[PDB]
Design an enzyme around this catalytic site. Structure first.
Site, PDB file in Angstrom:
ATOM      1  N   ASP A   1     -13.226 -15.589  81.134  1.00  0.00           N
ATOM      2  CA  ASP A   1     -12.188 -14.867  80.402  1.00  0.00           C
ATOM      3  C   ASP A   1     -10.819 -15.408  80.791  1.00  0.00           C
ATOM      4  O   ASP A   1     -10.470 -15.431  81.975  1.00  0.00           O
ATOM      5  CB  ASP A   1     -12.270 -13.368  80.672  1.00  0.00           C
TER       6      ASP A   1
ATOM      7  N   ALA B   1       0.841  -1.190   0.000  1.00  0.00           N
ATOM      8  CA  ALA B   1       0.000   0.000   0.000  1.00  0.00           C
ATOM      9  C   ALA B   1       0.879   1.243   0.000  1.00  0.00           C
ATOM     10  O   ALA B   1       1.797   1.359   0.819  1.00  0.00           O
ATOM     11  CB  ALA B   1      -0.937   0.005   1.207  1.00  0.00           C
ATOM     12  N   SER B   2       0.592   2.171  -0.909  1.00  0.00           N
ATOM     13  CA  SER B   2       1.369   3.396  -1.013  1.00  0.00           C
ATOM     14  C   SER B   2       1.067   4.329   0.157  1.00  0.00           C
ATOM     15  O   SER B   2       0.140   4.112   0.942  1.00  0.00           O
ATOM     16  CB  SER B   2       1.078   4.103  -2.336  1.00  0.00           C
ATOM     17  N   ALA B   3       1.879   5.380   0.271  1.00  0.00           N
ATOM     18  CA  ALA B   3       1.727   6.335   1.360  1.00  0.00           C
ATOM     19  C   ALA B   3       0.455   7.155   1.186  1.00  0.00           C
ATOM     20  O   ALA B   3       0.187   7.687   0.105  1.00  0.00           O
ATOM     21  CB  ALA B   3       2.945   7.256   1.425  1.00  0.00           C
TER      22      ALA B   3
ATOM     23  N   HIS C   1      -4.492 -18.990  74.387  1.00  0.00           N
ATOM     24  CA  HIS C   1      -5.920 -18.792  74.168  1.00  0.00           C
ATOM     25  C   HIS C   1      -6.487 -19.731  73.115  1.00  0.00           C
ATOM     26  O   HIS C   1      -7.635 -20.165  73.248  1.00  0.00           O
ATOM     27  CB  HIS C   1      -6.207 -17.339  73.787  1.00  0.00           C
TER      28      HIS C   1
ATOM     29  N   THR D   1      -3.017   6.078   1.727  1.00  0.00           N
ATOM     30  CA  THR D   1      -3.915   5.297   0.894  1.00  0.00           C
ATOM     31  C   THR D   1      -5.061   4.678   1.693  1.00  0.00           C
ATOM     32  O   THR D   1      -6.128   4.425   1.121  1.00  0.00           O
ATOM     33  CB  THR D   1      -3.099   4.213   0.155  1.00  0.00           C
ATOM     34  N   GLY D   2      -4.923   4.530   3.009  1.00  0.00           N
ATOM     35  CA  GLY D   2      -5.961   3.885   3.789  1.00  0.00           C
ATOM     36  C   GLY D   2      -5.704   2.426   4.102  1.00  0.00           C
ATOM     37  O   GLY D   2      -6.532   1.559   3.799  1.00  0.00           O
TER      38      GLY D   2
ATOM     39  N   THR E   1      -5.511   1.122   7.152  1.00  0.00           N
ATOM     40  CA  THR E   1      -6.406   0.746   8.240  1.00  0.00           C
ATOM     41  C   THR E   1      -7.823   0.566   7.708  1.00  0.00           C
ATOM     42  O   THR E   1      -8.602  -0.237   8.232  1.00  0.00           O
ATOM     43  CB  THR E   1      -6.368   1.804   9.345  1.00  0.00           C
TER      44      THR E   1
END
EC number: 3.1.11.5
Lengths: 123, 747, 1156
Positions: free
Chosen positions: C1062, C19-21, C938, C23-24, C26
């Site tokens: 206690d 993919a070129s710079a 205890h 371009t999309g 994502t």
């Protein structure tokens, strides 16, 4: 050897951890008489008195049952001068040793140097 | 409501003000009825603790954190675990002193910080770096050097207590010097503790059965620690856990032997599973995590930390489990447990609700996202209601308007004026008000004209220490402040090399002791008994190359070193009585030596000495032997010039005490050797030649990548950050004015 | 390289997408995610629709993972809404909705996916390998709990020190002398080996065999040198060489020099006169002896032990570190990746690969240009075959600028050679139509501009929507790219930096001042907007030049922001500043360190202030007092409140804000304070925190958590960014001042051009240097491509004839070594005129050029604006009430802190420190003190068989399990029988006659009290009606409200007449006479136990009135019996026991006093 005896003597509150660790370090695995002599030397140098007669260290019996302590070698080696010269860590004072015996009293090397310098400056 | 924030600190700081606003607005509300349900309390306890302890007196509300991990006396508990990690240790001095820094372990042996400050520099300078004993060295499969160990350091300290350090070695160990007076009891306490550590690490080695493992925890606690009014609860908890695990192992009829490293790592994991929850409903505001099977109805429920990837908390199945592949009705999972806990937390709230999460990163102002549950809740809220303003506009537009109205994006920093603007989201803090209203004044300049008068007696040593470095002497002499860095932490390694600052200081000491032309074998033996040179062959090589350099230097030293005398100077110049002593003065002249490189500072010190000698007698040349064909030379002068220049230097001294005198001699010496020559007696005025002189000056000031420059220093960094053209022109002109003494004096 | 559409990609086998710079990427990933989640594509589709938890995506960085998760969730929600409504506006959503047939089934699938999204796998490589190891731990050989660690620098240092002490101490003097000049020590060894210690092991070219010893190499060198020494000893005594006059007449002097040189062979370097008898020396200016070739046989090969010792250290240190970490039980990222690789490569890898492939039968390896050989081997081994399982690689090779991180481009080259499918993208959704043509013209000049084979540049085209982008500056339009050219012939780096920064700042302020008046418009079609201070953003590549351009730009009066520093906060001045301040506040008694903190640069004092503080003593005293108070606040409530109080008292926050260039310091101060608080909460002491701070100053790491935050964002400033962290961002206008600067690679590290395997060389062959320099030039070309393509509307840059040769000027420049020069001059060196004419050749309607001249007019016009006045809100009433819950801790004072919260059932009422009292006989009086023996005594008595006699074996077992010495058994077994048979109260005595139906142990009560209990009003009725209240220290309490808590030890009955029992273990009553009825009565008043009487009787009465109907206090109660465990003799009546009875009216008064 006698390290548990020194520890219970410290527990009885007349010897210090500094004194017992110093004696253990300077003596290593030496004779019981030499270790007790080093420990009492450290204690009596810590109390302030520079004098330390042999008769007192052989007849005090204060901090421990020192008769049964000093009966640990063959017989009873009362010749403390010979048993003190026999140890490599002690000489008469010519060799650089921490323990010095000059006037029939055993005291530290630093006190011996201070006394010798102040005597030479006095004369 | 929903509150998008940046950092956890800012989240808790917002929540405090919102809680205060709710409490002030509602007349019938109690801190007993407010809960804050953090997703994990371990990552949010410090910020909450800090802000709720930093709330002032007229703004304070009580708080109580619940459901933490079961360690509250952290020094005691981790100190005890580190005690159980003894036989695998390496016994570095920092670790040993870290055990001393615990107050209980320090008060067991009756030593305080007043002794600890002594023992820090004692272990730093005595040479205690490596492990405890030769056995500890040999069990790591390393050559048993026998030097720079704990036994070595204690033997050296006690031998120095017995005998002075000027008597030489007795058993190949040089005695120490400082521990001589009434302070050796601290050394004795440390030695006793070290002996106890050695005994217990010898006793902890071999494997034991459970019947022999039974009493060792109680024995360790009683032998090492000291019971107090608070630590006894932690000791009882430790004893209970140890007893429970070993009793279960015994009751399960195990017959073999087990190593210590199993029981230690089992106790250290069973400690971190219990919780403390006895402060839950005590009355303060309830801070707790999300726990299942607990749904108490409250009035205000606040949830913090709803980030994606943090809630719901995840836990993976073991893989070889069989209930995962075949599910049924009764199975329970952490994911759906937390998902139902969210529904219970939504139902249990009766009056209000408060959900907050990080929505934007504080580091790069990026975007983050909330959890899916919060996203679904916000979506349903938006799809179920509409604002009264737009009665019929659009479904999606109304949803967007409602979701924008409910969310409240807070600010990034506390002192933003939007916090203190009047309205709804107003803050209750007051310490940031003058910082947010911009009502302060800027910093002034550090250096100021300080009125200094000249006394009638300045000693010669004070003038020498001033003129060694004038700016630094102004800092640590007139106003008595030095930027002394942090103390050198004790290194974990023996001295392998001698480079840099270590080269400078230690090698300066070694060479300055080595000069004296006496027997070298005794001196080498004494310094190796002191434990400074490297091990064996490398130390022999270093000593040999230093000897073959320094004998070559001492050849030309003795080739004209006629033994002289040492005299005393008393003189009256400008009504001032300069007094001092003279080292290495002879009828021949001035012949000195200092084992370092050639420097105009050294030449100028020789120059001063020559001028004071010429002021009181003083005929002869001025030489000072240095390395790499070191030479200094000037013929003797007359008393008129001697007194004139001495008065000029005293005036420069009296000005440099009052004002920060700019003298950079070495870069100034380079510009001296570039511009002023012995053939022209006039500076150059050509632009290219003056820029070349500027180039030499700037490379002397700041170095290239290979070497460091003079200007890179803490004092010059304090004066200014960078070298602007205005101030470097000022430096050149101030050189031409006040360094003009040195410019004329040294050619 | 075909055209790519996301709706027609065949999802079978292996694929590759470039993919070129701009371009999309994502966008394409999300589209493929939706397509795979729906199972669409027709004949090019997956066989079955998958689910959410079976779509693995290995995304590079965590911010990218978060953004990908958000975008996928939003796309799924919008697609589900559009499928429900059957209409949409987005073209891809319209195409997908036309493709899908079953709308209801699609809606159900998307709803289930959206609900399942809180466990989706959009993960990283480490988070993937960690879970796969923890899943198949049986196949991989791992533990089930591993504590992570990231501090490996100390481990590497210890490993190198161990290697030094292991293989350099037994060596003798004649070999230590050899190694000494080769390197000084382990510091230099680490400095030479640190870059190769980590990662994939480099393949050493020509390695020595394993049988060679270092002493054997020394002996071999010694043999090789005295062979030629013996040959010279044979050959001396003749002059048979060629006599020439153009040489030196002292050749006989050289022969005699060698002849007297033959004495010793202890040296390692040979003399300088052996360089003129070689065949090279004879052919540069007659054989007659074989020594003529023997000396060439000597000199043709170098001599060194460097390769051998480096190989040994590199093979030993890594294994030592791994062994130590395995022994101590830690784990790391590289270790996890290597362990997964080893377990998959080894014999057990088949079942592991089958499990992973049947768990995740698809993968989208994002950012493929940054790929390691280990990761590529794992991906190949898992997904290289076994059909109906796909794999989609996505990456851009032209932006691989992360070489220093550890990635490699040749692995991508090998993957590109292996994969038989290629796809690419063409459109550009961001840049300008003139900009894309300018970049195409700049990069399409020569053939293979990236100086490799498998990286072909192709032209790109812009969209039809952005065809109206423009830029007008005072009327006419402006070209996209415009170089600025220095005038001259030779240049230097400092002057270059100075003039380019000044020209850049001048043009920036000219742009800003021309755009503030609505004249310089960023016009897009028919719209218009003015420029601001946010659009302009320069792109620098280093911090020093960033600071320099910052100083220039603030000299022309423009504020600026620095964005993307990689180093930590701890390397700046603030860290040492707070180290000094903390060291001073820890011990404020020392004048030196107090004054050294008072003179520090953020306190803001002057020499006059230091002088007036030094001379006066009362000011010094109050400074010491306030610093001691600060230390107390520290010791109580942590670090951050102490620093906050110090700042609020000393006005530092306002002073650093009123002083320019101080808000950055304030932000750094707040960050270091937050980090210090976070560390000090988890640490245990204060000096530990100080040591932590100092150690972190000494080691300024570059991790992902201790980075610098951006200082401010309230006002838009020009963003000086770094090229590496500008990858993926967007700015409208940029500047590239320093693009014509380069660095020359020197070290030998090159990749083979045949097998793409990394090769390490330990020799000075020029081929290795040239092969490294070629890769350096390719990396600089790719970085230049990124920096060029980040722009949108305008991109200016500066070209100058930079020369760094030692000589001044000869005519030829070394600018062809630069990334821009190698492209502009087409690879061949030129002159200034050639540079100018090749620039002018490319000046065609989109690219312009100008000569940079400095023009100074005015700083700026700031346009100061004041807004309003502000105030802080007020609190007008009391914050909270005094509701509490107490457990009898009002009377026993503080000091007993969190002990009750830690151990609820603890014996709180016993305290003290023990000693040694070891009398030889054993007695119950000699039982040790403390709380643990008390809570043992205890805990003994709740679970017993009172009627039946006690068994000695049970006592022995209890004492053995309790951690006590087992000799206490005979003493305890009679003490229990002694205490179990006491005559308590003339009836119900001798507790063994009590059955299990008449006892109830360890009760717990709760008493709600309203009408806040005044401490005086409680005592004013207690003191009257009781004689034991003679000793009166009252009001030990305060106003409290709420509940009450307490434990009753045991309550029994004997024909009515209930009781309260206690047990109380206490101090060492060494004599039995210290436990009499007078001593216990004195201790009762001395410890104030008398409150428990009335409290417990009221608590039991309020329970009897609820349980027993028709209850009478006089006819049913009887009283309270106290005992004392220590001091119970065999036959000694009424000793150690205590009986008391209330007054029957005090209870009736105090009941209604509590409850109304």
């Amino acid at each position: 050897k006698l390290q548990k005896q020194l520890l219970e003597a410290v527990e009885h509150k007349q010897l210090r951890p500094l004194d017992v660790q110093f004696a253990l370090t300077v003596a290593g695995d030496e004779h019981p008489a030499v270790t007790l002599a080093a420990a009492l030397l450290s204690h009596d140098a810590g109390e302030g008195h520079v004098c330390l007669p042999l008769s007192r260290l052989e007849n005090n019996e204060a901090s421990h049952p020192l008769l049964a302590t000093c009966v640990s070698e063959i017989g009873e080696l009362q010749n403390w001068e010979e048993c003190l010269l026999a140890s490599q860590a002690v000489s008469r004072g010519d060799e650089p040793t921490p323990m010095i015996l000059c006037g029939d009293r055993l005291y530290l090397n630093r006190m011996w140097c201070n006394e010798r310098t102040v005597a030479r400056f006095f004369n | 409501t929903f509150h998008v924030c940046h950092s956890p600190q800012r989240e808790v700081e917002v929540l405090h003000d919102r809680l205060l606003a709710m409490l002030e607005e509602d007349p019938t509300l109690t801190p007993r009825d407010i809960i804050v349900m953090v997703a994990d309390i371990d990552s949010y306890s410090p910020f909450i603790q800090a802000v709720f302890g930093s709330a002032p007196a007229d703004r304070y509300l009580p708080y109580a954190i619940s459901d933490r991990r079961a360690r509250q006396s952290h020094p005691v508990l981790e100190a005890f675990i580190s005690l159980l990690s003894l036989p695998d240790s390496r016994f570095v001095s920092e670790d040993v002193l870290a055990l001393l820094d615990v107050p209980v372990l320090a008060a067991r042996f009756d030593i305080t910080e007043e002794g600890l400050r002594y023992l820090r520099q004692w272990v730093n300078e005595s040479g205690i770096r490596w492990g405890i004993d030769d056995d500890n060295v040999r069990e790591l499969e390393l050559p048993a050097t026998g030097q720079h160990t704990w036994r070595f350091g204690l033997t050296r300290m006690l031998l120095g207590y017995a005998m002075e350090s000027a008597q030489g070695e007795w058993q190949s160990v040089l005695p120490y010097d400082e521990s001589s007076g009434l302070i050796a009891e601290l050394v004795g306490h440390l030695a006793s503790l070290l002996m106890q550590l050695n005994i217990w690490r010898r006793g902890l080695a071999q494997e034991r059965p459970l019947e022999e493992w039974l009493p060792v925890c109680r024995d360790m606690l009683n032998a090492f620690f000291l019971p107090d009014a608070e630590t006894e609860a932690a000791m009882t908890l430790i004893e209970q856990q140890w007893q429970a695990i070993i009793a279960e192992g015994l009751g399960a009829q195990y017959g073999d032997a087990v190593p210590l490293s199993l029981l230690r790592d089992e106790l250290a994991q069973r400690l971190d599973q219990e919780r403390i929850s006895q402060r839950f409903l005590a009355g303060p505001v309830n801070i707790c995590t999300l726990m299942p099977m607990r749904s108490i109805p409250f009035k205000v429920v606040c949830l913090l930390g709803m980030n994606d990837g943090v809630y719901p908390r995840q836990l993976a199945p073991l893989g070889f489990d069989l209930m995962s592949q075949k599910p049924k009705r009764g199975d329970r999972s952490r994911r759906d447990d937390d998902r139902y806990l969210f529904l219970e937390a939504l139902i249990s709230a009766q009056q209000k609700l408060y959900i907050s999460y990080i929505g934007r990163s504080i580091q790069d102002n990026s975007e983050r996202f909330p959890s899916v549950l919060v996203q679904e809740l916000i979506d349903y809220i938006g799809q179920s209601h509409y604002l009264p303003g737009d009665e019929a506009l659009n479904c999606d537009e109304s949803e967007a308007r409602v979701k924008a109205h409910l969310t409240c994006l807070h600010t990034r920093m506390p002192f933003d004026p939007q916090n203190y603007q009047p309205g709804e989201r107003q803050s209750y803090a007051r310490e940031w008000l003058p910082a947010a209203s911009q009502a302060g004044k800027a910093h002034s300049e550090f250096v100021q004209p300080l009125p200094f008068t000249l006394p009638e007696t300045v000693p010669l040593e004070t003038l020498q220490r001033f003129w060694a470095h004038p700016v630094r002497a102004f800092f640590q002499m007139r106003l008595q402040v030095n930027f002394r860095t942090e103390d050198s932490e004790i290194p974990d390694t023996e001295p392998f090399i001698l480079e840099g600052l270590s080269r400078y200081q230690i090698n300066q000491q070694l060479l300055n002791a080595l000069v004296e032309q006496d027997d070298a074998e005794r001196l080498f033996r004494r310094f190796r008994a002191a434990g400074d040179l490297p091990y064996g062959a490398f130390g022999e090589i270093f000593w040999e190359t230093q000897c073959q350099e320094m004998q070559q230097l001492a050849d030309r030293v003795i080739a004209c070193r006629q033994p002289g005398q040492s005299m005393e100077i008393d003189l009256a110049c400008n009504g001032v009585q300069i007094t001092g002593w003279l080292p290495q003065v002879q009828p021949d002249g001035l012949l000195r030596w200092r084992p370092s490189l050639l420097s105009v500072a050294q030449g100028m010190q020789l120059w001063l000495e020559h001028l004071v000698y010429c002021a009181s007698g003083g005929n002869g040349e001025s030489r000072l032997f240095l390395r790499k064909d070191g030479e200094w030379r000037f013929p003797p002068l007359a008393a008129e010039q001697a007194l004139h220049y001495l008065s000029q230097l005293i005036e420069g001294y009296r000005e440099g005490m009052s004002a920060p005198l700019l003298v950079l001699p070495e870069s100034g010496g380079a510009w001296l050797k570039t511009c002023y020559d012995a053939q022209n007696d006039a500076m150059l005025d050509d632009d290219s030649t003056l820029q070349k002189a500027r180039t030499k000056f700037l490379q002397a000031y700041e170095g290239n990548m290979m070497v460091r420059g003079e200007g890179d220093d803490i004092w010059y960094q304090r004066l200014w950050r960078q070298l602007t053209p205005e101030t470097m022109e000022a430096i050149v002109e101030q050189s031409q004015r006040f360094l003009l003494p040195l410019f004329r004096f040294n050619q | 390289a075909e055209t790519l559409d996301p709706l027609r990609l065949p999802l079978q086998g292996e694929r590759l997408i470039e993919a070129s710079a701009g371009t999309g990427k994502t966008f394409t990933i999300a589209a493929l995610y939706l397509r795979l989640l729906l199972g669409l594509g027709g004949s090019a589709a997956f066989p079955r629709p998958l689910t959410v938890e079976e779509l693995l995506v290995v995304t590079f960085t965590e911010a990218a993972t978060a953004e990908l998760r958000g975008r996928i969730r939003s796309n799924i929600h919008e697609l589900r809404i559009a499928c429900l409504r059957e209409t949409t506006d987005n073209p891809l959503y319209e195409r997908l909705l036309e493709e899908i047939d079953d709308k209801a089934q699609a809606a159900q699938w998307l709803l289930l996916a959206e609900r399942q999204m809180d466990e989706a796998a959009v993960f990283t490589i480490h988070g993937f390998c960690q879970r796969m190891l923890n899943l198949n731990a049986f196949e991989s050989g791992m533990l089930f709990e591993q504590q992570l660690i990231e501090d490996e620098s100390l481990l590497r240092y210890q490993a190198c020190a161990d290697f030094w002490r292991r293989h350099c101490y037994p060596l003798p003097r004649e070999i230590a002398q050899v190694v000494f000049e080769t390197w000084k020590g382990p510091q230099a060894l680490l400095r030479d080996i640190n870059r190769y210690l980590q990662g994939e092991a480099p393949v050493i070219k020509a390695p020595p065999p394993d049988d060679e010893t270092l002493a054997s190499r020394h002996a071999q060198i010694v043999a090789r040198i005295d062979t030629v020494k013996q040959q010279w000893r044979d050959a001396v005594g003749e002059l048979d060489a060629l006599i020439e006059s153009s040489g030196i007449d002292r050749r006989k002097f050289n022969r005699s020099n060698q002849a007297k040189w033959i004495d010793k062979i202890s040296a390692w370097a040979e003399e300088e006169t052996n360089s003129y008898q070689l065949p090279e020396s004879l052919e540069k200016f007659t054989p007659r002896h074989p020594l003529f070739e023997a000396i060439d046989q000597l000199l043709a090969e170098p001599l060194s032990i460097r390769d051998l010792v480096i190989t040994r250290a590199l093979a030993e240190i890594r294994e030592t570190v791994a062994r130590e970490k395995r022994r101590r039980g830690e784990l790391g990222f590289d270790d996890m990746l290597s362990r997964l690789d080893s377990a998959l490569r080894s014999e057990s890898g088949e079942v592991l690969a089958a499990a992973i492939r049947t768990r995740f039968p698809v993968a989208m390896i994002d950012e493929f240009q940054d790929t390691d050989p280990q990761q590529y081997r794992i991906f190949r081994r898992i997904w290289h075959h076994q059909p109906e399982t796909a794999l989609l690689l996505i990456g851009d090779p032209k932006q691989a600028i992360y070489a220093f991180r550890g990635a490699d481009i040749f692995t991508y080259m090998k993957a590109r050679s292996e994969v038989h499918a290629h796809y690419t993208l063409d459109t550009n959704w961001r840049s300008a139509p003139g900009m894309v043509n300018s970049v195409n013209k700049l990069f399409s000049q020569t053939d293979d501009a990236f100086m490799f084979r498998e990286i072909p540049f192709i032209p790109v085209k812009s969209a039809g929507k952005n065809q109206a982008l423009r830029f007008v500056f005072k009327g006419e339009t402006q070209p996209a790219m415009k170089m600025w050219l220095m005038e001259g012939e030779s240049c230097g780096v400092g002057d270059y930096q100075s003039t380019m920064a000044q020209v850049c700042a001048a043009q920036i302020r000219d742009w800003l001042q021309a755009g503030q008046r609505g004249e310089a418009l960023l016009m897009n079609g028919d719209d218009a907007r003015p420029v601001r201070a946010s659009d302009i953003s320069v792109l620098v590549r280093s911090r020093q030049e960033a600071a320099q351009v910052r100083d220039a730009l603030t000299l022309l009066e423009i504020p600026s922001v620095y964005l993307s520093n990689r180093d930590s906060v701890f390397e700046t001045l603030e860290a040492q500043e707070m180290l000094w301040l903390l060291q001073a506040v820890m011990t404020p008694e020392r004048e030196n360190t107090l004054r050294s903190a008072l003179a520090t640069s953020m306190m803001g004092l002057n020499a006059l202030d230091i002088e007036t503080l030094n001379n006066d003593e009362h000011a010094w005293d109050v400074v010491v007092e306030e610093f001691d108070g600060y230390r107390q606040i520290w010791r109580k409530r942590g670090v951050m409140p102490m620093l906050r109080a110090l700042m609020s008292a000393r006005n530092i926050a306002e002073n650093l804000l009123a002083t320019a260039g101080g808000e950055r310091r304030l932000t750094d101060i707040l960050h270091i304070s937050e980090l210090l608080q976070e560390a000090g909460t988890q640490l245990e002491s204060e000096h530990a925190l100080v040591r932590w701070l100092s150690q972190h100053i000494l080691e300024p790491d570059s991790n992902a958590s201790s980075q610098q935050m951006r200082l401010e964002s309230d006002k838009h400033l020009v963003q000086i960014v770094t090229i590496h962290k500008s990858k993926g961002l967007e700015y409208p206008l940029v500047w590239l001042p320093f693009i014509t600067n380069f660095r020359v690679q020197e070290q030998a590290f090159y990749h083979d051009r045949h097998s793409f395997e990394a090769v390490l060389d330990l020799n000075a062959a020029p081929e290795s240097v040239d092969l490294a320099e070629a890769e350096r030039l390719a990396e600089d070309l790719r970085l230049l491509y990124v920096a060029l393509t980040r722009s949108v509307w305008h991109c200016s840059l500066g070209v100058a004839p930079l020369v760094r040769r030692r000589g001044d000027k000869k005519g030829d420049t070394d600018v062809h070594q630069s990334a821009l020069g190698r492209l502009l001059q087409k690879g061949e060196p030129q002159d200034a005129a050639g540079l100018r004419t090749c620039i002018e050749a490319l000046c065609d309607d989109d690219i312009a050029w100008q000569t940079a001249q400095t023009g100074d007019n005015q700083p700026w016009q700031v346009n100061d604006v004041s807004t309003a006045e502000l105030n802080a809100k007020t609190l007008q009433r009391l914050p909270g009430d005094n509701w509490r819950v107490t457990s009898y801790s009002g009377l026993q004072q503080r000091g007993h802190g969190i002990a009750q919260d830690l151990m609820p059932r603890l014996d709180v009422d016993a305290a003290g420190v023990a000693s040694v009292v070891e009398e030889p006989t054993l007695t119950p009086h000699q039982f040790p003190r403390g709380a643990s023996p008390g809570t043992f005594l205890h805990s003994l008595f709740e679970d017993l068989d009172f009627t039946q006699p006690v068994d000695p074996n049970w006592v022995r077992e209890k004492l053995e399990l309790g951690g006590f010495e087992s000799q206490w058994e005979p003493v305890l077994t009679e003490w229990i029988t002694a205490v179990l048979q006491a005559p308590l109260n003339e009836t119900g005595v001798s507790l063994s006659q009590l059955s299990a139906r008449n006892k109830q142990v360890e009760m717990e009560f709760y008493l709600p009290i309203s009408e806040p209990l005044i401490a005086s009003q409680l005592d004013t009725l207690i003191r009257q009606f009781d004689p034991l209240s003679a000793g009166c220290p009252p009001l030990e309490f305060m106003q409290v409200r709420g509940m009450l808590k307490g434990f009753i030890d045991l309550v029994f009955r004997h024909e009515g007449r209930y009781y309260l029992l206690d047990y109380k273990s206490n101090w060492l009553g060494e004599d039995s006479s210290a436990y009499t009825q007078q001593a216990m009565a004195a201790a009762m008043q001395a410890h104030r136990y008398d409150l428990q009487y009335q409290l417990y009787t009221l608590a039991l009465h309020r329970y009897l009135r609820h349980r027993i109907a028709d209850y009478d206090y006089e006819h049913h109660f009887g009283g309270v019996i106290y005992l004392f465990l220590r001091g119970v003799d065999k036959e000694h009546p009424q000793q150690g026991i205590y009986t008391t009875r209330p007054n029957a009216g005090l209870i009736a008064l105090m009941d209604e006093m509590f409850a109304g």
